Every structure is written in C-alpha cells, then in structure tokens.
Design an enzyme around this catalytic site. Structure first.
Site, PDB file in Angstrom:
ATOM      1  N   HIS A  86       0.725  -0.990  -0.114  1.00 44.12           N
ATOM      2  CA  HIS A  86       0.088   0.055   0.024  1.00 44.12           C
ATOM      3  C   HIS A  86       0.814   1.205   0.006  1.00 44.12           C
ATOM      4  O   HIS A  86       2.127   1.072   0.484  1.00 44.12           O
ATOM      5  CB  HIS A  86      -1.054   0.036   1.183  1.00 44.12           C
ATOM      6  CG  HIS A  86      -2.176  -0.727   0.956  1.00 44.12           C
ATOM      7  ND1 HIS A  86      -2.927  -1.268   2.018  1.00 44.12           N
ATOM      8  CD2 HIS A  86      -2.872  -0.779  -0.183  1.00 44.12           C
ATOM      9  CE1 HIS A  86      -4.262  -1.914   1.548  1.00 44.12           C
ATOM     10  NE2 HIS A  86      -4.050  -1.881   0.056  1.00 44.12           N
ATOM     11  N   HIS A 104      12.351  -5.616   6.888  1.00 45.33           N
ATOM     12  CA  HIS A 104      13.054  -5.428   5.709  1.00 45.33           C
ATOM     13  C   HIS A 104      14.143  -6.627   5.571  1.00 45.33           C
ATOM     14  O   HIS A 104      14.835  -7.116   6.518  1.00 45.33           O
ATOM     15  CB  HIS A 104      13.695  -4.127   5.351  1.00 45.33           C
ATOM     16  CG  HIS A 104      13.806  -3.640   3.870  1.00 45.33           C
ATOM     17  ND1 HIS A 104      14.891  -2.901   3.519  1.00 45.33           N
ATOM     18  CD2 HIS A 104      13.045  -4.051   2.834  1.00 45.33           C
ATOM     19  CE1 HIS A 104      14.579  -2.642   2.206  1.00 45.33           C
ATOM     20  NE2 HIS A 104      13.710  -3.314   1.590  1.00 45.33           N
ATOM     21  N   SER A 433     -14.027  13.020 -18.117  1.00 44.12           N
ATOM     22  CA  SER A 433     -14.109  13.568 -16.705  1.00 44.12           C
ATOM     23  C   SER A 433     -15.699  13.819 -16.401  1.00 44.12           C
ATOM     24  O   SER A 433     -16.022  14.425 -15.030  1.00 44.12           O
ATOM     25  CB  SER A 433     -13.483  14.936 -16.386  1.00 44.12           C
ATOM     26  OG  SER A 433     -13.448  15.866 -17.566  1.00 44.12           O
ATOM     27  N   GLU A 434     -16.700  14.051 -17.164  1.00 43.12           N
ATOM     28  CA  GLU A 434     -18.100  14.160 -16.890  1.00 43.12           C
ATOM     29  C   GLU A 434     -18.839  13.071 -16.427  1.00 43.12           C
ATOM     30  O   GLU A 434     -19.862  12.908 -16.164  1.00 43.12           O
ATOM     31  CB  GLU A 434     -18.614  14.768 -18.065  1.00 43.12           C
ATOM     32  CG  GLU A 434     -18.141  15.866 -18.574  1.00 43.12           C
ATOM     33  CD  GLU A 434     -18.772  16.503 -19.893  1.00 43.12           C
ATOM     34  OE1 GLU A 434     -18.283  17.505 -20.676  1.00 43.12           O
ATOM     35  OE2 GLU A 434     -20.101  16.192 -20.096  1.00 43.12           O
ATOM     36  N   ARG A 460     -29.210  15.374 -21.504  1.00 51.96           N
ATOM     37  CA  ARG A 460     -28.006  16.025 -21.351  1.00 51.96           C
ATOM     38  C   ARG A 460     -27.112  14.959 -20.551  1.00 51.96           C
ATOM     39  O   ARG A 460     -25.886  15.227 -20.723  1.00 51.96           O
ATOM     40  CB  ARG A 460     -28.070  17.250 -20.697  1.00 51.96           C
ATOM     41  CG  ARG A 460     -28.512  17.141 -19.309  1.00 51.96           C
ATOM     42  CD  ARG A 460     -27.885  17.960 -18.366  1.00 51.96           C
ATOM     43  NE  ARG A 460     -26.050  17.837 -18.482  1.00 51.96           N
ATOM     44  CZ  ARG A 460     -25.343  18.574 -17.684  1.00 51.96           C
ATOM     45  NH1 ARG A 460     -25.671  19.198 -16.465  1.00 51.96           N
ATOM     46  NH2 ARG A 460     -24.032  18.146 -17.876  1.00 51.96           N
ATOM     47  N   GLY A 530     -22.130  35.334  -8.874  1.00 56.01           N
ATOM     48  CA  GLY A 530     -22.968  34.313  -9.499  1.00 56.01           C
ATOM     49  C   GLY A 530     -22.094  33.623 -10.643  1.00 56.01           C
ATOM     50  O   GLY A 530     -22.073  34.393 -11.759  1.00 56.01           O
ATOM     51  N   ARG A 535     -12.120  27.279 -10.957  1.00 55.94           N
ATOM     52  CA  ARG A 535     -11.827  26.402 -12.025  1.00 55.94           C
ATOM     53  C   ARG A 535     -10.502  25.980 -11.819  1.00 55.94           C
ATOM     54  O   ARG A 535      -9.476  26.965 -11.621  1.00 55.94           O
ATOM     55  CB  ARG A 535     -11.966  27.213 -13.169  1.00 55.94           C
ATOM     56  CG  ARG A 535     -13.355  27.882 -13.380  1.00 55.94           C
ATOM     57  CD  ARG A 535     -14.482  26.577 -13.909  1.00 55.94           C
ATOM     58  NE  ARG A 535     -14.093  25.800 -15.156  1.00 55.94           N
ATOM     59  CZ  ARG A 535     -14.161  24.695 -15.383  1.00 55.94           C
ATOM     60  NH1 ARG A 535     -14.758  23.900 -14.447  1.00 55.94           N
ATOM     61  NH2 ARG A 535     -13.667  24.119 -16.453  1.00 55.94           N
ATOM     62  N   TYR A 613     -30.528  24.932 -13.144  1.00 54.57           N
ATOM     63  CA  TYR A 613     -29.246  24.891 -12.176  1.00 54.57           C
ATOM     64  C   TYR A 613     -28.528  23.619 -12.987  1.00 54.57           C
ATOM     65  O   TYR A 613     -28.502  22.374 -12.534  1.00 54.57           O
ATOM     66  CB  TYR A 613     -29.458  24.506 -10.770  1.00 54.57           C
ATOM     67  CG  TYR A 613     -28.228  24.532  -9.932  1.00 54.57           C
ATOM     68  CD1 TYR A 613     -27.201  25.345 -10.239  1.00 54.57           C
ATOM     69  CD2 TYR A 613     -28.251  23.951  -8.767  1.00 54.57           C
ATOM     70  CE1 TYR A 613     -26.196  25.592  -9.570  1.00 54.57           C
ATOM     71  CE2 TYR A 613     -27.047  24.050  -7.863  1.00 54.57           C
ATOM     72  CZ  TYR A 613     -26.221  24.945  -8.319  1.00 54.57           C
ATOM     73  OH  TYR A 613     -24.937  24.965  -7.467  1.00 54.57           O
ATOM     74  N   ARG A 619     -15.168  20.610  -9.452  1.00 58.46           N
ATOM     75  CA  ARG A 619     -14.733  19.726 -10.557  1.00 58.46           C
ATOM     76  C   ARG A 619     -13.157  19.511 -10.314  1.00 58.46           C
ATOM     77  O   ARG A 619     -12.243  19.575 -11.422  1.00 58.46           O
ATOM     78  CB  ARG A 619     -14.987  20.289 -12.017  1.00 58.46           C
ATOM     79  CG  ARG A 619     -14.774  19.252 -13.172  1.00 58.46           C
ATOM     80  CD  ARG A 619     -14.593  20.248 -14.341  1.00 58.46           C
ATOM     81  NE  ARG A 619     -14.246  19.312 -15.199  1.00 58.46           N
ATOM     82  CZ  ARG A 619     -14.903  18.592 -16.338  1.00 58.46           C
ATOM     83  NH1 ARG A 619     -16.185  18.859 -16.342  1.00 58.46           N
ATOM     84  NH2 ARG A 619     -14.602  17.767 -17.245  1.00 58.46           N
TER      85      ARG A 619
END
Lengths: 656, 110, 110, 106
Positions: A86, A104, A433-434, A460, A530, A535, A613, A619
C-alpha cells in the site's frame, strides 16, 4: 491479547504460528497475498496454510479509505509491516500510539526502497539479514531494533536450514515481549550519514549482459543455492531458467566456438566457459543437453546472443483514431520526437498536423470512423497500440439530437474496442471527466467516488452515461478476455491549438476562451458572485507528458488502471483569470478597444444566475493514481499556460 | 430521495471498478435510447418500473438456486423444514411489497 | 470420509454459493430424541441428522481455516443455525437430451 | 498465364526439376569454388567432425516421406513445351551471392 497481522510467505506463516504458540490470539487478518499461479515452480503455500489454519484472503477494494477506518477502529496499538503493497499517506495512520515496525530484507541504510533481495544480489553483496525498524516520515531510515546475523555454512542442507530458521525464530521470540516490556531496545551505533538513494527497479534489468563483469557470474553462483528463483536466460528460440551451474576458473579463450565435448555441455564464450547443467523451460522439465541439441537441431558453435535482431529500438506502432484534434496533434509531436514509434492516424482533416505529413513515418490517411471500417480493422490488426481519441461533445449534439452521441460515441467505440479483443491489442481509452456528473465529493477519485446523473428524461446526461458504460465494458473485457487497457481521464486540458474557432468542448468546459473572446471588443461579463466559483486547469504540455508515460507503461504499472490527469492544485476563479489576463494584456494589442469597458466593475451586482441549475461547481481531480503509476506531478503554472495560450491566439489570428 | 420520482430523482451508481452496477447502467441507457428514439423518430413507448411485484408463480429454481431473487421464498422454505427465521443485517430494514394482481391491473391499462 | 484423506484436499460440498471441503468426521450413537437442527447443548456442540448421526470435526469453506463450523462462521462472517446442504436432483436427475438430425433414416429410426 | 490456344485448361501441371538432384550439395563442391568470392571478412577455414545422423534429420514413423520427391513433368512438356535448363550450380551461387548482398556489411 487481540492482534491483527499483515503476514506473507513462509516467514509470515511461521510468525503467525509463533504468535499463536506464545498465546497471542490473532483476531482477524486481511492480507494481500494474491500469489498468482500458486504452484508455479514450488510447493503450495496456500494449501499448506489452510491445513495449518491460516485464513488467507484477497480483497478487491482493499485500498478503500473506509476499509482503512474499519481497520483503525479495531484499536491497532502497534502496526506490523511485512512486505506491504500500500501507499497510504501517513497523515491518516499517524494515530497509532506505539508505532509501526517494518521487516526488511536489506542492509539498511544501503540501497533503500523495495525489492531487497534483487538489490543485494545484483550489486555484488555477500551480506544479508533482517532489519526491524520504526516507520516514520523518514521511511527506511529508522533505528534498527534488532539486526540478527547468519552463519556462512558451505555444507548447509534443507533440514539444517529449517532448524536454523526455527532457532532464529525462538531467538526473536525471546527478545520480543521482554524488549517491549522493559524497554531495552538499545541499538548499535551505525552511521546514518552514508545513505545513498537509488530508486526502485523493474525485472527488465535482470536480463544478462555479456559486457558486464563477472559480478553476474558471482550472483548466479550464489543463486544456484537452495531453491532461489534461478537465473533466467533466453536463447532466442527457447527461453529457460537455469537451476545449477559450475563455472570453471579458466579464461578459456582458446578457439571461440569450438565445442570440446557436448557431454557435459561446455561452450566457450568471451567471458569464461559456460557449462549448462540443468534448466527448466518455463513450466517444463530439466531436459539434458544432448536431448535439447537433437530436438531443435541447434548447430554446435552457435554463439549465444543476448537479444535478437530487430528495427531501431523497436517500432511499436501507435494507431491514433483522430489526430487533427487537441490531444492527437499534441501526442504525435512527442511520439515522433523520441523515435521508437511509427504513429498512424485517421481524421477528417490535416489542418493541425501539416508539420508531420512529411515526416519519415507518420502515415496519415484521411477518413471517418463510420464510413471507413476496413482501414480501422486492418490497422488494429497491424498496429500495436490504439487510441480512440475521437469524440463529438458539442452541446448542440447533446440537446438537438441525442441519437448522434450514441451511434457515434458508443456504437463506434464499441466496434473499435471489439477489434482490440479479436487481435489481442492494447487500448488506451480516453474516458471523460463528466462521468461523475453531480458528484457530491471534494476530490473526484477514480476508485471511490460515486457517479450521479439526473433522470432519463433529461437528454444531457446521455453522453455521460454512454461514456461510462464503455468504461464498464472495457473493465469487463479486461477481466474475462485478458484485454490490456488504461482509462485516463483528461481534466480541463488547456493549451495552444485548442479549437481556434468556437472552443466549447472536447478539450474542456466552457470556462476559457470566453474572457479572451470578450477581450476582442466584447464587454466581458465578469460576474463576481454568480457563476464565479472555482476553476482548475491543466496545461497541455503536462497532460501530454502524462499520456506519453501511460503509453510507455514503465513496468506495466498503468495496466488495467483508471488515471486522472488534472491539476487540483491550480485553482483559479473567474475574477483571478480575468486579472491575470488583463495583467498580461499589455504586451502590444492595446490599440483596439482603447476604452476598457467592464474593466474595474467592483460593485457587487445583485444579479443572479439563469433558470436551470445545470452548471457544475466543484470539478477538482484527485491525482494519486497518476503519481503512483506514472510518478507524474504537474509542473507548469497557470501564468505560463495563460501566456502561451494568449500568444498562440493573438499571434497568427492577429491582423493588426 | 425518500420517494423515487420518475422525473425529479437522481440516479446514483458506484465507481467503474465495481462490476455489479453494469446492469443498472445498461438498463438506464436503454431508457435514454427509447426516450431519444421517441423524440426524433416519434416512437410510441411507455416505461413501467415494477418494484416488488410478488405473487404465486414467482419462481422455484430448486430453492431459488443459490438465493437469487430470494425475497420471501426462503422464508416459506423455513416454514416447512423447521428452520429459524434468520435476521440478516439485524432485520431493521423495512420492505414494501406489491400484489401481482395490482401490478397486472396497472399494466393491463398501460 | 476416509476415502478423501491425504494427500487429497478432502470431500467437496457446496452450500449456497460457497464450496467447502471436509477432512474428517465422527459418528454418534443412533439414539436420538430431538428434532434435526434444534440445538439443546452448546458445550460440546451437537447437531442431529435425519438418518444416523454424523458430527463435523474439520471443515474449511473456500480458502479459510480447517475447524468446526462455529469458528468458521466467526472468521468468515456466517451466522450459526444454518444446516449443511447437499446437491439436489439425486438418483433420477434428469433425462439426457439427444438431438438427432435425420431421425427418419436407417440408423436414425433404429 | 499465356495459355497459347486454350490448351492449359483443366490441367494439374507440376513445375519441378526431376533430373536436378543434389546429394548434400556435393559435399560443398561448388561452395569450394564459390567461397573465394572477393572479400576476406569472416573468411576462416572450417573444422570437421561427425557424431550422429539422428540429430540432423527425423526418421520417425508418422513424420516420414516414403520414397523420394522427384516429380513427373508430362503435362509441362506438352501444354507449355517447357523443359528445365538451369542446373544446381548457378542456383546455388546466385542464392549465396544475393543473400550476401542482402545483409550488406553488418
């Protein structure tokens, strides 16, 4: 009394047996044994453990942080690291009171990292042992609690070795509980200042080199002892693993090629004489030399080559399925620079790849993925790797006709994927990525995040669901038919040559080319509250490097993997982007739009957003599979990306 | 979402590495293809979702094979061979069934 | 039971979707006065059977631990009270299906 | 392919040289004359020795061509009026020369 242990191999089995004998009842173990092929060339560890009563498991999603919390809730006072696989960050695991002890098989601090046996054997080292130490931020740099030693026995046999291992186990048990109880773990002063890092290796370096000194000869002489894996050799026609050899201490240059006797097989070489006693061809038998000679009709005197003859550093043929696009025309630059590749391509035009059409090997053929299917099938048949980099993600296609984002973005990709299973070819599928949709998560993780979409009456989300079922049929094909694949997700890739006319999709969201378009006498609408949000953006020069490393497959680390290629540490609000653009907007083209309309509107407009909306807010990618599989970290900053993007925009397009 | 609305509720599935969500997405994309076909080619359609239609004829499969679509069948099995009522996950969860006659009368006039 | 001793894995059986192996078992006197499946004593754990009386000493489900059913359920996560289920369709099984193409011929009709 | 007068239709012509046999290239006889060529690179006199015929070829039951492989050119001499002219020597020297030229130097 309760204990959880991450044990492995016969060492782990004997450790568990010793702990059980000591009275410590193991509550539950959740191991990562795997062990593919079980009885490959040795006894059955799994069945032996089962008869010995050691519950062995192999959980699929052991890397889930929820499972980590489940383990943490069992009060892990101490942590034991026996060959752990891991890469969990220490920040979560720091809540261990006593700490962690790691076992080890290397001579710390020399040659740190992983694969202790290979490192100690290869670099001519005659000393080995066990190293137990604490695991801190300074991994493989902790004080050694106990460093046991072995006795060099020329006449050691299996029974004596087993008894010696049992006695060593007894010795370890004698100073395990008392050492923790009283606290006498005083170590011998060893010089920590001599630590030198070398990284981790892949088994490809283990291939025999003729020019290398007799160090490899010494390594194999030590490795033909009690059942080590064995020296792997390749003739060119038949590969084998040698079980035992005897190197004669004579140079024996004499007459190169002249075989004195075939019984035993003793051939001359540039470096000594090789006497191949016994060897197994994979999972075969230890055939003697005369039978091998009479079977394949190997001409006596044939000087063993290391590698067969081929083209210039191999010519893995990369079939791109759209190259005039944003990613194809940038990946072709890198693939055509470091030789080693014969790129192909099929797109509707050659506007952005006019600089490779004269290259010695770029092989562009114009076409469409629909009308031309024999070309695509034949080139999946011949070309080594396939990149279906074609897509039509225009919102007009989302809304006007959702029957084009299915028969061209799902059906054609389904056809292409099934060419890579007929001819057993690699594929690197450009997932989107959507797929996450309205994911209510901070970091979009490729292995833990949920995929949220709206009702089926909204046309959509049909693109996000069509491209998500493809990642599920690719996953199903690679676990039932052996398909090799990678499912990289480009997260807001920005850079030059990104859709010079109406950049809306394929590369990224709307976001960019709005401020720049409004800078050309367009009165930029810089909404402060708004729609501002945040981003993240990735320079194309970084995403293309990540994709090149994915194609490289340095150690088959990207096999059957899903990787996010983004820059989550590159946040930039709309206002910040506007400020950077305006600060950069002084180089020359101030002659037009001399009055700065919408230049310093600081007053908080009460204006809200519009009905519906539908705009995503968070993102942010989660680039951890990229770091673990490619050792790739974004480097280029936002200012550089904006600068080169703006230059490419208003350099060639600029008329004044 | 409390009530699984036909036109307001969102659809959530697990990550790609889980192969058990391929049926939910396969049958979810088939509803998005019928919807697309009914708007660009005027396909006449209706999509009914039966939640827990149960009644006499459901399945036998030699004790539901391994337990596929178990629901009430295993309970009826318990009521014959003197078996106790097992409470998986503690039995706290509530279940809402539907008579097959109700669903059939609702599907008859579809 | 003794036929599946070493060097063999042991007798193979399947319950639900999980396969388990048995290494050895013990007999008990046929005198019984309790219904099969009803537990009346836990130390030692004694179960009843329809005919005869066999007690499981060692068993292992899939890749686990070769012990009694209590420890096996504790480790794997199963719940106590479940009986051991064999493979149905014994004896008569089913009629094998033979597809003859050209049944009305010389060889076919005979 | 010429088919002079449609007289090759429906025929099973064998195209071979049943008379040009060669027992192990005559122990390298022509190779003795053609090893001189012109270059001196890699040119060393060979050694000698023989251990067994078994290692070279297979003389099993299932994998065996009984008799030999000499064809019978009867339709070739009638439908084509063709008869072999080139012998084994020119073939061997041409093959060796071309193979040497197709590997250049290294």
């Amino acid at each position: 009394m309760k204990t959880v242990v991450f044990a492995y191999h016969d060492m782990g089995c004997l450790g568990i047996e010793a702990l059980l004998a000591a009275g410590y009842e193991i509550s539950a173990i959740f191991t990562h044994t795997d062990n593919p092929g079980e009885k490959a060339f040795y006894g059955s560890v799994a069945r032996l453990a089962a008869e010995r009563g050691i519950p062995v498991y192999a959980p699929d999603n052991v890397n889930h942080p929820l499972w980590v919390e489940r383990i943490a809730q069992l009060s892990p006072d101490v942590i034991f690291s026996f060959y752990y696989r891991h890469l969990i960050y220490d920040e979560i695991l720091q809540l261990a009171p006593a700490g962690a002890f790691n076992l080890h098989g290397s001579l710390l601090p020399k040659y740190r990292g992983r694969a202790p046996l290979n490192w100690v054997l290869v670099n001519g080292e005659t000393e080995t042992g066990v190293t137990l130490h604490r695991m801190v931020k300074r991994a493989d740099a902790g004080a050694i609690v106990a460093q046991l030693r072995i006795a060099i026995a020329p006449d050691d046999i299996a029974i004596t070795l087993h008894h010696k291992l049992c006695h060593a186990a007894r010795q370890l048990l004698e100073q395990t509980l008392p050492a923790i109880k009283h606290g006498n773990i005083l170590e011998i002063a060893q010089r920590e200042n001599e630590a030198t890092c070398f990284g981790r290796r892949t088994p490809d370096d283990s291939f025999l080199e003729w020019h290398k000194p007799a160090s490899v000869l010494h390594n194999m002489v030590r490795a033909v002892a009690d059942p080590w894996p064995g020296a792997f050799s390749y003739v060119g026609n038949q590969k084998f693993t040698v079980w035992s050899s005897r190197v004669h201490p004579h140079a024996s240059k004499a007459q190169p090629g002249s075989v004195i006797s075939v019984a035993p097989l003793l051939i001359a070489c540039g470096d000594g004489a090789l006497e191949i006693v016994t060897g197994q061809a994979g999972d075969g038998i230890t055939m003697q030399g005369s039978q091998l000679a009479q079977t394949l009709g190997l001409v006596q005197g044939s000087r063993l080559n290391s590698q067969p003859a081929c083209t210039a550093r191999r010519r893995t043929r990369v079939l791109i399925l759209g190259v005039n696009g944003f990613i194809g025309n940038h990946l072709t630059e890198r693939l055509l620079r470091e030789d080693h590749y014969e790129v192909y391509g099929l797109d509707i035009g050659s506007d952005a790849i006019s600089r490779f059409l004269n290259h010695p090997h770029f092989h562009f053929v114009e076409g469409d993925i629909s009308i031309h299917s024999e070309w695509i099938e034949y080139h999946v048949k011949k070309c080594d790797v396939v990149l279906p980099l074609v897509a039509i993600a225009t919102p007009i296609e989302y809304t006007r006709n959702p029957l084009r984002v299915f028969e061209l973005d799902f059906e054609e990709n389904l056809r292409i994927i099934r060419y890579c299973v007929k001819y057993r070819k690699r594929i690197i599928f450009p997932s989107t990525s959507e797929v996450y949709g309205m994911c209510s998560d901070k970091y979009f993780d490729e292995d833990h995040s949920n995929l949220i979409v709206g009702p089926v009456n909204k046309p959509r989300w049909i693109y996000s669901v069509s491209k998500q079922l493809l990642d599920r049929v690719i996953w199903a094909y690679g676990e039932k038919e052996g398909l090799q694949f990678t499912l990289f997700r480009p997260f807001n890739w920005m850079g030059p040559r990104l859709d010079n006319l109406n950049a809306a999709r394929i590369g990224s969201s709307r976001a960019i080319t709005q401020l720049i378009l409004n800078l050309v006498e367009g009165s930029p609408i810089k909404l402060i509250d708004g729609g501002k949000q945040k981003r993240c953006f990735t320079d194309i020069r970084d995403g293309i490097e990540a994709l090149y490393r994915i194609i490289e497959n340095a150690g088959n680390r990207c096999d059957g993997e899903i990787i996010n290629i983004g820059n989550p540490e590159n946040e930039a609000s709309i206002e910040e982007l506007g400020e950077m653009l305006l600060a950069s907007f002084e180089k020359h083209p101030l002659r037009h739009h001399f009055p700065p309309f919408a230049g310093f509107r600081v007053v908080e407009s009460s204006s809200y957003y519009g009905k519906g909306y539908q705009d995503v807010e968070h993102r942010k990618p989660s680039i951890r599979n990229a770091h673990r599989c490619l050792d790739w970290e974004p480097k280029i900053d936002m200012q550089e990306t904006i600068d080169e993007t703006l230059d490419f925009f208003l350099r060639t397009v600029d008329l004044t």
